[PDB]
Every structure is written in structure tokens, then in C-alpha cells.
Amino acid sequence: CKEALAKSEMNVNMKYQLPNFTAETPIQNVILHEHHIFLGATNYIYVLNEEDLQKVAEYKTGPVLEHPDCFPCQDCSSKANLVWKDNINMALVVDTYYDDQLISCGSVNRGTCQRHVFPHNHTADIQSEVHCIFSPQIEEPSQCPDCVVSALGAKVLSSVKDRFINFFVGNTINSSYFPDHPLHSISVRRLKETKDGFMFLTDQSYIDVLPEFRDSYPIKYVHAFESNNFIYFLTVQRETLDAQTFHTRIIRFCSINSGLHSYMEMPLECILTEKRKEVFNILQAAYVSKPGAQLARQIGASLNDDILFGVFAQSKPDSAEPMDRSAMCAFPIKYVNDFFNKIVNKNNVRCLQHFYGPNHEHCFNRTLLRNSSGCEARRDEYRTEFTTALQRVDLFMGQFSEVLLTSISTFIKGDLTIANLGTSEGRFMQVVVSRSGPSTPHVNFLLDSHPVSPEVIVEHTLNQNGYTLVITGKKITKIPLNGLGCRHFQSCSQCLSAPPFVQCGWCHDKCVRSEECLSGTWTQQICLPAIYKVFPNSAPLEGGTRLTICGWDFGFRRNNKFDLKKTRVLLGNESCTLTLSESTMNTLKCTVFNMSIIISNGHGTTQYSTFSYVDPVITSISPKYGPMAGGTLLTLTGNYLNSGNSRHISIGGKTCTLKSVSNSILECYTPAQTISTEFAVKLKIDLANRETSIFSYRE
Amino acid sequence: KRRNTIHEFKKSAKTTLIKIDPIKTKKVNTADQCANRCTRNKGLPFTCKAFVFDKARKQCLWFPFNSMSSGVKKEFGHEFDLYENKDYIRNCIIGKGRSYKGTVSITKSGIKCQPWSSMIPHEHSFLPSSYRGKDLQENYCRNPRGEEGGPWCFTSNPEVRYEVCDIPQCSEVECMTCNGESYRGLMDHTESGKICQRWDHQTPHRHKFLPERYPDKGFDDNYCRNPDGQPRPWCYTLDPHTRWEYCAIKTCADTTECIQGQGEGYRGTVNTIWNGIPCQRWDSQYPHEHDMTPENFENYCRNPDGSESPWCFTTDPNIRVGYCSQIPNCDQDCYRGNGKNYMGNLSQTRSGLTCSMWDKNMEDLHRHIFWEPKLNENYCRNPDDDAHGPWCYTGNPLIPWDYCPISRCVVNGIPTRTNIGWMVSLRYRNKHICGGSLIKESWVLTARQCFPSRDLKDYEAWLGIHDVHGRGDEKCKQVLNVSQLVYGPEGSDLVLMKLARPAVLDDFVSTIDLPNYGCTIPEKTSCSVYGWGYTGLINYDGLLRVAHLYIMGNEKCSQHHRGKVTLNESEICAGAEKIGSGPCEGDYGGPLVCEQHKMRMVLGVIVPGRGCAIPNRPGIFVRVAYYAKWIHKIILT
């Protein structure tokens, strides 16, 4: 039996009270700074304590009244007419290069942002200072400089380059709203020292789709980061202007204050390939971090070589949504940089579809000096679109291929690395990552109905004090990365599979920390076999029948595998038969006066005192007379008739249809025979041949 | 019914045809429907040998002639696309060759074919009127009935009536290589005689390969390709029921340790994975059968499918694929500011140019400078022990030498009473942006952060003005184009401009002397800065505005920054007199000038950073003396 022992695996649901805070409105972004965590949520902003998990203060960008004549920060309080919209923060950043500043951004106010200051004595007040970054472009009102945040999609990266604050923003915008307000899909806003506006340094400082396709070609930006003086963007789009399919891409460009000079895009796919193929199209979340040492060997990198981890989900047929099927895939920065620079040949390179246009003179007769130029800024830049994609394999080998992962974060501990997966339902988990094999989730509990937001914050001071901040629906939670407990482990195998940093050990009854054994028998090296049930408990020393053994921890404890060859089963001196095909670490099969059974796995042994030496016997039948057609119930009696699995009761080679079998009474109906005389009945318990009282036919 | 036959046509991109001595256009949405019309019998009264469509035109036009027809002009028209009938191009036999249009009119016996219009010497020549659209030409032999024998014609020879023309099959010319992907030929027929559907189409198979998405692999109309690395090319079947079929082609006739690429072309006798588990041979399917076979292309770690790493099936049955990741793939100074200490194996410059011929380099260096009486030709090593790092001479006539990139360890403005010619107003887009300092008759310096553009035909220099655009003195203002700009050393963030023509000196305009290279500044030394830029006033009349500045050391700046900045010898700190006043936007590249005793001289350059003049907070400027020797070296040009 397998389901009867469902107590084997870790109890997937057990409730914990974590440091948590509830929001009145959905939360969009999160920022940590100086033991203060800032939460931009629907129309609101909050400040939260790092340890206390208490709202220090809050401020409202509440329900927004809009007037067509009204400008984003011009006074409009006296307006008695109008829309009643709601601002939500897609772009939130803390900057410290100039001063301790928060740049927040609302969705409705023409995508205009606001600036807030902190006093030194009190580094948490935000209502003290409010500052619109709203510079009237009297020079060229054709382009709105401070109109930055697109209401449809926004991804913002702030950085400090050449002693200026630079904002690389990728904005998804529909063609409908373009004439209302001119925006650019990808732009670089550089901060004025006066902190009152931005300047577009040149025309080539921005790149955006040609107007005709601004309805088609949906480009949604999902991540951005910086490495090796490059700004990378992970974003989804169609395969081509015609495909209507979807696939994600990496975008790199050189961060010169002027604008994007060397603009490259390359398509990324992650595939589950087996011997003698599932491709994940849509990226769900991403996170770049330093790798684990074992992972450093497994991927060929150093402890400082930065690796990007992406959650990829297969797209719906000609649609951007997934089928709730997700995987995690790793990409070293060195390999992707080299693929961009050297590996791809010349003729595969193409011109940008949405920017250049197929019927235009550049990619007619323009080429690249790929091998002889890298990040070089030339005024007649050539925007490139590689057609050769980069493929990688899921390191989990599809351990989550049936479920969707909504978010992901990573951290490391000694030689190993642990990923903080977030499930579409909101089932946060932590799992050790390794190419060795699938990893059991040492924590799997369900948090909330709402999905886990892609906004996730990690922190680990001193490699001792660690915790992650996770948003979900209207609640944020601080989950320490030091584990929660060892009690939930319900098998020695599961208990020992736990990472060393959580002190898990079987205390002869259940897994627990070392100090918590009253009995002092804490163990972390051996798995004593445990018997759940035996089917059945009676067999002769020669009688042989199918024997099912339900239990746990039968297999030899190896690092990942659990072998059955390193196990013996004995009926005292006699050894019970081993059927390794039907015998597992969980279940076993044998086919052989109360007696005990000793099962010795690769580490320990256990005795089961229920087996008995009996033999079925027969006393009488009823009745003795029956017609030619048969069909007569034989109230067969005896003892040990319920030992062993099966009984064959037949007369003249034709089965007496068995209706009921018990230890004391047996019943069968005779079939229609061919002669009418005095015959006996034959019983089989698969080895114990037994004859009974003769039964006479009539006609 | 309603059928499709463009799958039998060819296709060309961005082309159109014009016959000088000739054909009708109709508005049709689908060019495929037009091609079907052209094939469909009686559809066009003429013999539609080709078709042309333009999506922009949405116009459909058939040509009764091929591209091979004499007197036609090909025009490279992006919007127009050509669809040619491959039968005239086939020049071979498929099956019975029912629709054969070959321009062959000879028999195996070499007697000329009897014309199909003249019924002598044999009278079975009513077929030109019997069968419409079958394209039996004046004399060329066809298969009007699609008879199994092939193209047969009547002989003008009397004794023999008709004989089948010997015309080759199509498999004769199309050979095959083991890889298959390299092959790109003319077969468009599957192994069972089916025809490959249009790779541009999406019906009746909604496959994955998109020819524009995946170019470079011959994803043409219907010609067989090997995209998935099969031993043979295959194509999706025109039949909706048959998913895809292979293409029958006869075969053609007539290693290291380091890793190149991802191991595709690489072969290696090593077959041990990082786990150390070896791998079995390709013949031995043990433990679990592997699809790949040697006939498709030992027990080594190869890459038949061209994955990221070569993979060989581990002897362990549980692991299907193991990757030998231990393979190696074929793929700077500190505290030594003098390049003589390190032998830099670098033939490149910071700008990316290669070096020059070191013989003439040594000759010119010795002639120019005789500092001291070795190194290798064309390398990062330098003889002069330059503090800014190793460098190398360059062959560029404009610049003969460049550094080799190896890592080694006004707010509250008071207007000026008079005008000073040391300032240069950076004019781009016909307006001031930044301030520059005049060193020579043809040399200015400013900050690197004042150049949105890397070109020069847009910038402009305006000199000798007391106002923003010289609103006062139009009599003496001067305009000069920029001839060259040069970026400073690593982290210097300074640029040197030589103008299109040196400006003759005058009382107003002034060139400025340079600091002593080893000089140091005393604390609190008052100096002056000049600017046209932002001042915070309600109205900037554009007049030159002056401010006074005072030196402070690393400390008071650092506590004023509260540890924000860790200062360096490349930097000079100086702040105001506890009042709110300092450089801001529009003043970048402005000069800080000071005197030893009487002769005033530039010590600093206004650089953007850390806000505009926060009261009681000193500003940071470059050390001009940190580069004075380098400027003296570059002045040789």
C-alpha cells in the first residue's frame, strides 16, 4: 500500500505566524533603505520598520481628480468639474548620490514623478518635502521631458554615471494614447542638478517603435539591471511582425550619458530536452546574483561571476499567458556577453524590425565590425537584432513543469545556493539548487490566495542574519532565510535531506534539533526501517504467496539516491524473498507459531512480531446434495481460512464461484457440471492442497 | 471547387518584371488565389507563365512569359514580388511528368520531333485543340495524357510514328551529404511523392519554422531542408492529414584539446563528465536506447545536436545525458604607475586603434624628448614612465600616440565688471552650453560631460563676449568652428579642443598659463570663478558673473559630505565663505584661476557633481597639475 502511508511526506500545510504587515490597497513596488522599507501601493506610500514591522508613517496620493486642461502639478483644487482615477506607483527609487531622496511616480498624472527629502535627525519623514519634477519645456514643447511613466507598462533603472543620475526606462505604451502625450519606449532621462526636470541629451538618446506598429508588436519589459557597465533589459515581444507568437529577449546597450550607442537584442529560450521537447517562451521573473560554489563548478564560474536566474513559462498558443507550467534557468553573464560579442557570425545579424523597418536603406547594405569593435560609440550607430537565440536547460529538470512560478529570488549559503521560488497561487518555497537532481522543498507552506508579487527583496548580513521581504496581495511578510523548523519532516530520509544550516535530526520518533531531545537519542546519520503494515501476517515455512510490506525508510540512505540492494529481509534464521522490482524504499514484496520479521537496510534494522505459522484446515461443508444445475451455496467451514491472499475452490476443474471468505466460514456456489455422482471439492491457498467433505450431485 | 496551386510555383523577393514589347491588373487580396487562377485551366486566355503581386498595390497581374523570355527587364522593386512557374524551370521528370513544359524537341534516336500543328507525316496532331492548357508547344514533346512512358513526340521520320524523348529525372542532379543541413537543392517532393508545402505558408500545418525569423537555412518555397539535424531533409506535407515526410536523396560523391565554439565542430576523445562517469559508444544503445546513429553523421563526448556542451550518455542508467564540462575553451597592473615595470602584451590603444611602427616611434620620441637613453615593438610598454599609465605610439597622422588601456593602481552670481577672454562659450544648437578655458591660440579645455554629440559639424565657439550671446559687444565677438576634440586620460573627464582656425590674440581675449606640475596649493587661498550659467536669479541678463572661492583640505569637505566622498590626489576641494553660492548647470568646464604671487593661473575646472551650491558645503574640481605634463606631451600635435 502507498496511499495509506501518506503520512510519509512532509505536511504541506502547517500555519506559521511571520512578521507581517497588511496594506489597505494593492502594493506595486518596494524599497529598502537604512532599516526602513518603503512601500508604494495603490494611491498610497508607506514606511515600515525593518525589525518592528510597524508602519512608521504614510502619505496619500489619493483618488485623483483629472481635468483635460489640468496639468500634472498645476493647482486644480478649485476645479468643480472633471475623471476620478487612481495613481499607482510603477516607478519608485531611492537615490543617495546627491541627497537622501525618494523619487516616486504616479500612473495617472501624465506619468509625472515627485521627489521627497529626509531630514538627518528624522530619516523617515516624507510629507515634510514634496517636489514635482515638472519642467515646462518652453524650448521644444513637441517632446515632454518630464512625461516619463507610461500607464501601460514601466521598468525603471536608476544609476550614477559621469557624476549624473541616469534613468533607463523601458515603457510599454499603446498607439491610442500616443497623440495625447508623446512618449518613447526606451529612453534615458538625466537628472538636472537643480532636481526640477530632465533633458533629452539628443535625438538618438531614445528608441521607440515606428508609429504604425505601436498597436501591434506588444513589447512588455519585465526586468532590468546593470553589469560590466552594460544595462540589460529582459522583455517579451513577438517572434516577428508576422509570428504573433511570443518570446523573451535580452537587450544590451552602452551607458554613455548621450544615449544608446551599441544596441543589441538576443532571444532567450529554455527547453526541457530528454533522450529520444518543451520550450518556455514567457519570462515571469528574474534575478541576478553571485553563484554558489558548487554551482560555480557546475556552470564553470567563480564565486563572484554574476549569474542571472530566470523563471520561464511556456506561452499560450499565439498568446502571452502561460499554461501554469514553469521552470527556472540560469545564465552566466560571461557566456551571454561572449555570445553577443564573438560567437554569433556576421550574416545572422539583422536590422531592428520595429525601429529600422525592413524596407529602408540601412540594413540594405550596412554591416558590423563585430570582431573588431565592442561597446565603441560611433555616431552612425548600427542597431542590431540577432536571429540566433540562446538555449539553456532547466536545472530542476522540470520539477515544477506542472505549476507556474510567479516570482523568484536567490541567496547563497556556504558551498550551496538556495532559491526562493514563488508559486502562482502564492506558495512560497525555498529550495537548494543543484544539477545533481531534483531537490525536495524544505519549506512549502501556502501563504495567501493572491499570487506572490515579482517584487522581492533579499538581505543577509554577516551570512548569519538573513531574511527576505515578499509582497502578496495586500500583505508584506518578512521570512527569515534561516529556515523555520525541522518538526515537519515525517521521515528519516526527508529529515536528513534537509540542508545543514537547519539542525534537523531524527529523535527516534521524528525529526528535531539536537538540543530538543528529552531522550537524548538525536541522530543524523542512520535511517532505521519502519514498518507500516504487512499483507498478510500468516504464511507457512514453505507456503508462498504475494506479501506486501508497507513502511518507510527501507532503502539505504545515500546522498541523493536510495538503493534497495543494500537491504535484507529475514524470517529469523530464514531470509524472506526480495523482489527488488516491486520493492522500494517505501514498499516491499516478499514471497516465502508467531514469528518476527527482521528487515535490515543499509543503516539499521527493525523487527515486526506479527507473522505466524499456521495452515488452513477444513471441518465440514453444507449441504451434501445438489441438483444437476449446481448453483448451491457450500457453507464451507474450517480454521485459518483467512490466512494468505487468495483461494481457488473448484469442482471437476470448474470453479465453485466464491461468494464469501472468512476465517471460520466459506461460501461458494457450484457451477453446472457434466455428471451427477459423488465428488469432492479442492481448495487452494496457492500451496496448501486441501480436500474436504464429498458433495453429491442429483438429477 | 476551390483549390490552391501556388505550392507548385516559385517565389522571388523584392523583384518585378517589365517586358518592353508586350497582362492585366485586378484588385485581389490574396496573391495565392491569383497563382491558383493562373494554374487553373482556361483561367487566363494567355499562357500564364508567371505572376506578380504587390501588397502595397494589392494589385494582381499575370505575365504570359517567364523571366527567361527575351527582352524582359528585372527591376528591384521592394513592394513587388514574383511567382514563377517551376515546371518551365523543372527541366526534369517527376513521376510520369504529366505537366512537363521542357523546351526539348528531340528523341532518343536523334530525329527531330514532328510539329504538333502540322499533321505530316503523321496525322495525330489535333491535340493542340484537343487538350487545353496542356502546353504542347509548336514542336517540343510533352505528356498530354500523362502517360507512364514520359514525354513522347511524333518523328518527322516516316517509318516510326512516335518515340518517347529521353529526358532525365530530377533525382539525378540532387546529391546528398551525411549532415543534410548543408544541402540546399531543388527537390520539393517527399519520399512518397508528396509535395512540400510553402515554408512561408501557415496552412495546412501551423509549424514553427519562420523563414524570416530563421533565415540562412534555405527556408525557400518547398525545397527540402534539414533544420532539426536529421540524417535527411524533411518537409511538412501539403496534405493536412500527413504531418511531415522525408525527402529521398542519393548521396554525393567527391580533434584538438581546446574548445572552439560550443563543441559542434569540435571532436574530443575525452568522454568523462565533471562527475567522472564515462560514456558508452554510439553503437551500444546500453543502458537506454539512443536515437542517434553513426549513419546519421566511438564512445566520446561529442555534440550531435550542437548543444551548449558536447554530451555523451553516462554509463549510469539513471542519467540519460552527461556533459563533459571540464573541457577548456579557447579564451592588469597595480601600484606600478610607470609602464616600464610591466611588459604589456597589448597592441591596442584606449581609443581602440592599433599601434604604429616602433622604429619611427623611437626615432621621433628620441628626437622630440631626450629624457634618457629595450622594450618590444608594438606593445603597451612605455619608455617614459608616464604617471597616467602605459601608452603606445599610434600610426594616425592626426594623433601619433595614445594610452593602452591596462588597469593600474553660478548660484548667487555677482556680475563681472569687465570682460575676460579666458572664457569660451560652447555653442551647440546655436546656444551656450558650457565654459571652456583658452590655453594656446588654438587650444581650449572643458569637461567631457558637455558633449551630447561626438561629431563637430554642429558645435560652435563664441569668444570675446560679456553677455550670453554677446548682446552688448557685437563689434568684437568672434565665431570659430571646432577642428578636433580629444578625450582626457582614464577618469580624467576632460576634453581638449583645437578650433578650425586659431583666433588672433587681442586685449579682450586671453590665453592662460598652466600650473607647476608638482605645485601644491595653500589652504583658504581665495580665487575666482566666472560663468554665464544658472544663478538662481529671477532674470539672467546673460552677463558674465563672478564668484570667489576658498581652499579647504580633504577633511572639512569629507565631514561636510559626512563621508560621502573619499578624496583623491586627482581632486582639489574648495568651498565658498559659508554662503550659498557656487557653480550650477550651464557653468560646466568653468575655470578656477589663482596666482602664485601676481600672475593668475588656472588651478581648477568646474565639473558637474553633488548638487548646485548647498550652503556650507565645499565643491570639487580637477587638479590641472595632475595632467599638466600629459597636456605638454599632447601639445606636440
Author numbering:
A (entry chain B): 26 to 107, 111 to 304, 311 to 626, 634 to 740
B (entry chain A): 34 to 55, 59 to 290, 302 to 344, 351 to 384, 389 to 430, 434 to 469, 495 to 722
What does the paper say about this structure?
All six domains of HGF I (N, K1–K4, and SPH) showed well-defined densities in the cryo-EM map of holo-complex; however, only K4 and SPH domains of HGF II were resolved, suggesting that the first four domains of HGF II are less tightly bound at the receptor and thus become flexible. The top part of the Π is composed of the SEMA domains of two c-METs as well as two HGFs; while the lower part of the Π exclusively consists of the IPT1 and IPT2 domains of two c-METs. The distance between the two IPT2 domains of c-METs in this structure is ~20 Å, hinting that the two membrane-proximal IPT4 domains of c-METs are likely to be positioned in proximity in this specific dimeric conformation that allows the intracellular KDs to undergo trans-autophosphorylation. Strikingly, in the active structure of the c-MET/HGF dimeric complex, only HGF I simultaneously recruits two c-METs by using two distinct surfaces localized on the opposite sides of this HGF. HGF II, however, only engages c-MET II through the interaction between HGF-SPH and c-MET-SEMA; thus, the second HGF is not directly involved in the c-MET activation. Our cryo-EM map of holo-complex shows strong elongated density peaks between the IPT1 domain of c-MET II and N domain of HGF I that can be assigned to heparin, based on the size and shape of the density as well as the local chemical environment. First, our model shows that a heparin molecule is sandwiched between the N domain of HGF I and the IPT1 domain of c-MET II, and acts as a “glue” to hold these two domains together.
C-MET can be activated by its cognate ligand—hepatocyte growth factor (HGF). Structurally, the c-MET receptor is composed of a Semaphorin (SEMA) domain, a plexin-semaphorin-integrin (PSI) domain, and four consecutive immunoglobulin-plexin-transcription factors (IPT1-4) domains in the extracellular region, a single transmembrane helix (TM), and an intracellular KD. HGF, the ligand of c-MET, is secreted as a single chain 83 kDa precursor protein containing an N-terminal (N) domain, four consecutive kringle (K1–K4) domains, and a serine protease homology (SPH) domain.
